[PDB]
C-alpha cells in the first residue's frame, strides 16, 4: 500500500513536471531582450530614523504612505511619521523577542509576534490616549515569522510549526489552518485582491493558498536553501522569493513555473527581505552583506545599490504610492530612500 | 513651523527620553542562552520561550530557554551560551558532541562564549565504578588515554578533553569555552556562571581597548 502510494506520487510529480515543461516555449529574458534598459538608479537617504537601541527585525508601511511601524529587540514597537521623523507612538512589548510586525490597512491596529508564539494586536485609536493591546492570538506551536492584515478583523500569520493560520480577531480563534509545508514558514505575502496569498518555507518551497476554502493550489520549487522573503507582483499574477542561496526567483501563477533568476557571482550571501516597486519594474532585495540591491525585474540586471547600513539588513518595504523605500537593519537604524 | 507640529516634536522628544531611559535600565543586565537537550537536566542547573532571572553580587542574569536552527540568530548578542551535557549516558554522548559542534561553528554565534556544564557527574562516577558499561565500547580512544578514584578522574578528563577538542578547533580565540563538572545537588553553578561572565566581559573590554 505504502509503496503503491509512493509510486503514484512520483508519477504525479513527473506528470506535473512534464506539464510545466510543455508550457515553456520562450523565456522572460528572450521576450524582454529588446526592451529598453532601466539604466542607473541612485537613491539617496532622505530620512534616517533613530531611537531603536537594538536590532530591528520588521517594518511595515501604512496605507497612507506616511506612517510606518518598526519592531526591535529592546521590546519596542515604534510608529514613526516618515515625513518629519517624529515618533508618533512607542509601544512596550511584553516579550522582547519579536520577529514580525504589521500595520492594519485602516491604520487602527498594529500587530507583532515572535518567539513567544503569540500574535499581539494593539489598538492605536483609543479614547484613553494610550496604545493598549486589543487581542492576543494563541494556538501556534512555534515562533511567528510573519503576519499580515486582511481587514480590521482578519489576519494571516505564518509560524515555525510548518503551518499558516487565518484568524478572527474578534473571536480570537483560528478560522482556517493552512498545512502542507514541511519546514518552518518564514514569510507570507498577501495578494493585492486579498483572495490568495503565498508562503515560503525552510523546505525551499513556496505555496499559493486560497484564503476562502483554505487549501494549497500551487507549489513552486527551485530554491536550494531556506526561503526568507516573498513578495507579490503588483498585478497579483506573479511573485518573487529570496533565499539563503544568494538568489532571487520570479514565479508566475498562470505559467506555474519559474520565469527569472536574479543572482550574481559576487553575491554569496542570503536574502533577508524582498519587495517590488509600484510599477513592478524594480525588485528591491535586502542582503546580509550590509547593503540592498535593485534589480531590473524584466532583465535581471542590477540597476543600483542601496548602501549606508553598517550591519545586516533585516526588513525592506516600499510605500503604496511608490515614493520611497524603507530599509531597516541590525544597526538599530532604519533609513528612507527616494 | 506650526503649533501642532511643534507639540508633536515635543512629544517625540519625550518619547526619545523614555526610550533612552529604558535602554540605560536594560544595559545593566546580562543575558544567557540556555541550551542542551532533554534528560540533560538543563532546567535545574541553577537554583513559547521560557525566562529566568537570578541575582548574584548585585548583578542580574537573565537565562532564556527556548522550547536551534533558525531562531538562534536572534541570540547573536547574548553574553554567553550555557550548554548542558549529561555525561552519564554514553549512548547520547556523540549526539551531544555533534550538537555542541553545531552550536560552536554557527555563523551567528562566532563571537559568543560557551559555558559548558557537564551535568550529573555523580551518575558518571557510579557508572564507572560499577563497570557494567565501558567508555571504550563507544569511544575507542579511551583505551590509550591517561589522566594528567583514578578511573573516574580519567573518564571525566577524557570527556572534557573531547569537548575542548571540539571547542579549540576553528575557534581563533574570539570566544572561549568554559567547561565545568556539575552534579544535581550542586549549588555553586551561579558563582561559576558569574566568574565566567566576568572573564568574558573582561576579555571584551580588553579587546575593545585595543589591549590583549
Amino acid at each position, epitope marked *: 500500500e505504502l509503496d503503491q502510494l509512493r509510486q503514484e506520487a512520483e508519477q504525479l510529480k513527473n506528470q506535473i513536471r512534464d506539464a510545466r515543461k510543455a508550457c515553456a516555449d520562450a523565456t522572460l529574458s528572450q521576450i524582454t531582450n529588446n526592451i529598453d534598459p532601466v539604466g542607473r538608479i541612485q537613491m539617496r537617504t532622505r530620512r534616517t530614523l533613530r531611537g531603536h537601541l537594538a536590532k530591528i527585525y520588521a517594518m511595515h508601511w501604512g496605507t497612507d504612505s*506616511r*506612517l510606518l511601524v518598526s519592531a526591535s529587540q529592546d521590546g519596542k514597537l515604534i510608529i514613526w*511619521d516618515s515625513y*518629519t521623523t*517624529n515618533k*508618533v*507612538h512607542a509601544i512596550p512589548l511584553r516579550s522582547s523577542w519579536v520577529m514580525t510586525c504589521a500595520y492594519a490597512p485602516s*491604520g487602527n491596529y498594529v500587530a507583532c509576534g515572535g518567539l513567544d508564539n503569540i500574535c499581539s494586536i494593539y489598538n492605536l*485609536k483609543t*479614547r*484613553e*490616549g*494610550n496604545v493598549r493591546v486589543s487581542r492576543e492570538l494563541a494556538g501556534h506551536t512555534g515562533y511567528l515569522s510573519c503576519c499580515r492584515f486582511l481587514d480590521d478583523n482578519q489576519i494571516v500569520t505564518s509560524s515555525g510549526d510548518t503551518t499558516c493560520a487565518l484568524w478572527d480577531i474578534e473571536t480570537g480563534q483560528q478560522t482556517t489552518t493552512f498545512t502542507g509545508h514541511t519546514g518552518d514558514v518564514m514569510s507570507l505575502s498577501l495578494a493585492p485582491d486579498t483572495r490568495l496569498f503565498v508562503s515560503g518555507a525552510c523546505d525551499a518551497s513556496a505555496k499559493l493558498w486560497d484564503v476562502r476554502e483554505g487549501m494549497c493550489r500551487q507549489t513552486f520549487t527551485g530554491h536550494e536553501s531556506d526561503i526568507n522573503a516573498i513578495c507579490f507582483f503588483p498585478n497579483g499574477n506573479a511573485f518573487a522569493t529570496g533565499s539563503d542561496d544568494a538568489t532571487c526567483r520570479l514565479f508566475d501563477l498562470r505559467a506555474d513555473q519559474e520565469l527569472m533568476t536574479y543572482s550574481h557571482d559576487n553575491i554569496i550571501c542570503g536574502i533577508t527581505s524582498v519587495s517590488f516597486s509600484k510599477s513592478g519594474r524594480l525588485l528591491l532585495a535586502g542582503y546580509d552583506d550590509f547593503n540592498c540591491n535593485v534589480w531590473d525585474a524584466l532583465k535581471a540586471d542590477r540597476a543600483g545599490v542601496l548602501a549606508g547600513h553598517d550591519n545586516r539588513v533585516s526588513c525592506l518595504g516600499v510605500t503604496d504610492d511608490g515614493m520611497a523605500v524603507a530599509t531597516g537593519s541590525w544597526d538599530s537604524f532604519l533609513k528612507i530612500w527616494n | *513651523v*506650526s*503649533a*501642532e*507640529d*511643534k*507639540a*508633536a516634536a*515635543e*512629544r517625540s522628544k*519625550m518619547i526619545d527620553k523614555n526610550l533612552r531611559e529604558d535602554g540605560e535600565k536594560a544595559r545593566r543586565t546580562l543575558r544567557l542562552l540556555l541550551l542542551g537537550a532533554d534528560n540533560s537536566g538543563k532546567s535545574t542547573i541553577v537554583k513559547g520561550i521560557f525566562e529566568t532571572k537570578f541575582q548574584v553580587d548585585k548583578v542580574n542574569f537573565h537565562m532564556f530557554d527556548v522550547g536551534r536552527r533558525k531562531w538562534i540568530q536572534c541570540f547573536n548578542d547574548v553574553t554567553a551560551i550555557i550548554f548542558v551535557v549529561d555525561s552519564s549516558d554514553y549512548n547520547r554522548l556523540q549526539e551531544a558532541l555533534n550538537d555542541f559542534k553545531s552550536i560552536w561553528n554557527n555563523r551567528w554565534l562566532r563571537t559568543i562564549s560557551v559555558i559548558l556544564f557537564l551535568n550529573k557527574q555523580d551518575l558518571l562516577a557510579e557508572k564507572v565504578l560499577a563497570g557494567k558499561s565501558k567508555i571504550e565500547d563507544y569511544f575507542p580512544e579511551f583505551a590509550r588515554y591517561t589522566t594528567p578514584d583514578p578511573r573516574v578522574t580519567r573518564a571525566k578528563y577524557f570527556i572534557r578533553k573531547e569537548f575542548v577538542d571540539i571547542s579549540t578547533a576553528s575557534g581563533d580565540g574570539r570566544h572561549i569555552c568554559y567547561p565545568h563538572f556539575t552534579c544535581a545537588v550542586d549549588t555553586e553553578n551561579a558563582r561559576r556562571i558569574f566568574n565566567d561572565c566576568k572573564d568574558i566581559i573582561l576579555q571584551m573590554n580588553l579587546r575593545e581597548y585595543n589591549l590583549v
Partner: single-chain antibody
Amino acid sequence: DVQLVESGGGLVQPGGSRKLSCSASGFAFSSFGMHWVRQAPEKGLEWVAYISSGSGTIYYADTVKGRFTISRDDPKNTLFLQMTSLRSEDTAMYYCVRSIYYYGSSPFDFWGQGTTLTVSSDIVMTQATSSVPVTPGESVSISCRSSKSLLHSNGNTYLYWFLQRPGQSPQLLIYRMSNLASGVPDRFSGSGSGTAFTLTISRLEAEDVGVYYCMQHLEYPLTFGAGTKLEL
C-alpha cells in the same frame, strides 16, 4: 470613562487670588496637553492658557499673562490655574480641555465641565451670521471667515468646529476643517479654502440647536469666532 471634573470658582473680591483645579480620570493624563478656556456669561469662548505634556511648554493669552499661572501634577492627575489680581472682566465659566498632538490626532476632542468664577498680531475669526432660524430635516450651512489664511505649507488647514448645546460644555465636531470627530454623526461636513470656511449639516435633527464656534489653531493665541446660534 474619560472625565474632567473641576473645582474652585465662586465669588472673588477684585484683586484677590483663586486656584482652579481640574481632576482627570479615565485617560493617560500625563500624555495630554491641557488648555484652560473661559466663556463670558453672555459672550463666546476665550482661550486662556495652555500647558504642554511634561510641562515643557506654557502659553498664556495677553489678557491674563503675568496674572495667571498654569501648572500640572501628573502623579495626582491634576491641573491647576492660579489667578492673582482678578479684575471684574475675569468673571466667566472655565473649562479644562485635553488635547494630544501627533500626526492624525484630534486636539480639543474632550472638554471638561464648567467651573464658574464671579469677580465683583492675533488672527481674527469672523462669524457673520449671529442667529439662523432652522427647521428639522433641512440642511443648513454656517460660514466663518479668517483674517489670515489658516492653510499651512504642510497642507493642513488648522480650523476646528465646536458645538455648545444649551447648558452643556462644548464638544468637537470637525478638526482641521475636513476630518470628522469620532462619535459625531456623518450629517456634519466641513469645507472651504484659506480665509473662508463653511460647515454644512444635512437633515438637521433635534439636539443640534445651540452655538457653533470656529477656532483657529495655526498659531497662538488661539482665537474663536463670535458663534452662530441655530435655534428652532
